[PDB]
Task: structure prediction
Amino acid sequence: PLFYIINIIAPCVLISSLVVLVYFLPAQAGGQKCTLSISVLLAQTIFLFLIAQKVPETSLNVPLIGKYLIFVMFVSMLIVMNCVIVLNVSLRTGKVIDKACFWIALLLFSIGTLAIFLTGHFNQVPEF
Amino acid sequence: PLFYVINFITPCVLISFLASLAFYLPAESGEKMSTAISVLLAQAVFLLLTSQRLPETALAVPLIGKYLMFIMSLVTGVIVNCGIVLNFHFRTGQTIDRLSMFIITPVMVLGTIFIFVMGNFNHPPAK
Amino acid sequence: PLYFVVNVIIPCLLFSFLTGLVFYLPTDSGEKMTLSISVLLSLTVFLLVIVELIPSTSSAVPLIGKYMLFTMIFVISSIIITVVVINTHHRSAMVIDHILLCVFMLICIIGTVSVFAGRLIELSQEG
Amino acid sequence: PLYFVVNVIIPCLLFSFLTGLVFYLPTDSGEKMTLSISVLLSLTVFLLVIVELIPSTSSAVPLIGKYMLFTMIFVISSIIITVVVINTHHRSAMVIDHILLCVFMLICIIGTVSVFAGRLIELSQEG
Amino acid sequence: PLFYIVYTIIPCILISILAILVFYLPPDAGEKMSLSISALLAVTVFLLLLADKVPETSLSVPIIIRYLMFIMILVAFSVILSVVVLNLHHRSAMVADRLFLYVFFVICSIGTFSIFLDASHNVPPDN
Result:
């Protein structure tokens, strides 16, 4: 199923843009951009917190199975943690902005990849 | 049911800190007026959502306007003061302590005069 | 039941102004990019909640999925343009026309295509 | 039913980062105070809505009041620290460590105390 | 049944102060410009949520839009003025004085017209 998946994946693909953007924008962000990005953290953080709220109510409304749920919480948490680190990074704050873009990408494309593989693997056994 | 007052009182009390701090904020931090602006938005989304909870509550619970105006007027005043502080904010210094002394005098007085309102209501019942 | 097709078209039309203005707001005044940033958040919460309102409606009232794809696509392109227009903005007299020209041209088309898809679907609807 | 105790602890833990980062974000970069201001609004709407979600839950599902006081207290201290940490900010290399040291030390304790209150209540729960 | 009308009027009256002040906020403090934007976002989240509140209320008992069809337009123009102020600001004292006069004149008249609508509605529906 999931039509929402399309929608959920969409939130977390554009939102990677934000962080990638935020991250990427760091290296491609003006002096004022560190605080700007702060703005993205807040924004990126209200967006996810509300998605938690809808997802919560959704699970109670329909059947419950957390595996995929952990995947959403863990990726969200790390984007979340990366965001704080990016902030912390940008707060601590070029060397590490560059890598931070590298580290982000590398972590997202690895977490993402991992997450996608879990999906793939989740998708495969249920089909087998 | 002093359980709704708890949280609503706390909203107001901290929010007075916002305006008090805003009002004070004007004097101690005159150069962060965007920042204070941000608080107006924030302070203003917070209050607007509170009005929504109160509205739904009324409808759901018994409604009798008396204590309604008191919450509605204070909100509006903090609201109008906020707007004014902006006006002030924007204008902003000989007057500040007086705005300060006038703000705390006035807020005290209405707080006191609202206290009385509920206090005046209390006594009659008691007697 | 055209009560939603009005307000939705209105969200998009004004939102086009945000981008157009976001796009058009760079070329005319680049200095407000961060201020711009604020619009992206704002423009982005507004859209994200609209997808909400509409989700409950659609699921509440069933309809054909194909007309839903367009909303997503269009919405995702404003969304992708923003990202790029923000990267653009981030990276960002010739380029904005450039970006504005390629935005306008893309949105007029996409919008032209999407409006055709309704139009053509309107053609079929009319018969 | 531990589905809420997870997300609530996460809101606090990340929120601690906001204040830790807010606290830690001053010492490392004070220049973003207003930008900081924005976090206070943000950090403050997020918490104020959580008190909401939880209100409906608690009232929906009854439970013991004593465990609720802790949430309020803790939440009100982050809230009071912010206010002071804001004034602290506003007012605000030695002081932040100072404020950060006294924050950390207070939150580790308070948090230590609160975690004990769950712990000890956990001790009783376990038996 | 003046419960909601009095709150709605107050949203628009204070919100006019936001745009008046937003407008008025440009004559009195030009640098706010981007700060003014923040108001647009804020003023824009506030109205969009009101449409939603009013979106559900409408569900409970259908009748004349008059005010809505009235409230809808006023919102839209405040909306389209904010956007123009934004463009007027984006494009961006004589115009402001002009755009202050035009705003005032417009909103006094639209508000005069809208208030009339409200006035005219209560006599017509009353009969």
Summary: The interface with chain E takes residues 7, 10, 14, 17, 21, 24-25, 28-29, 31-32, 34-35, 38-39, 41-42, 45-46, 49, 53 of chain C (CB under 8 Å). Helices of chain C lie at 3-28, 33-60, 66-91, 95-126. The first helix of chain C runs from residue 3 to 28.
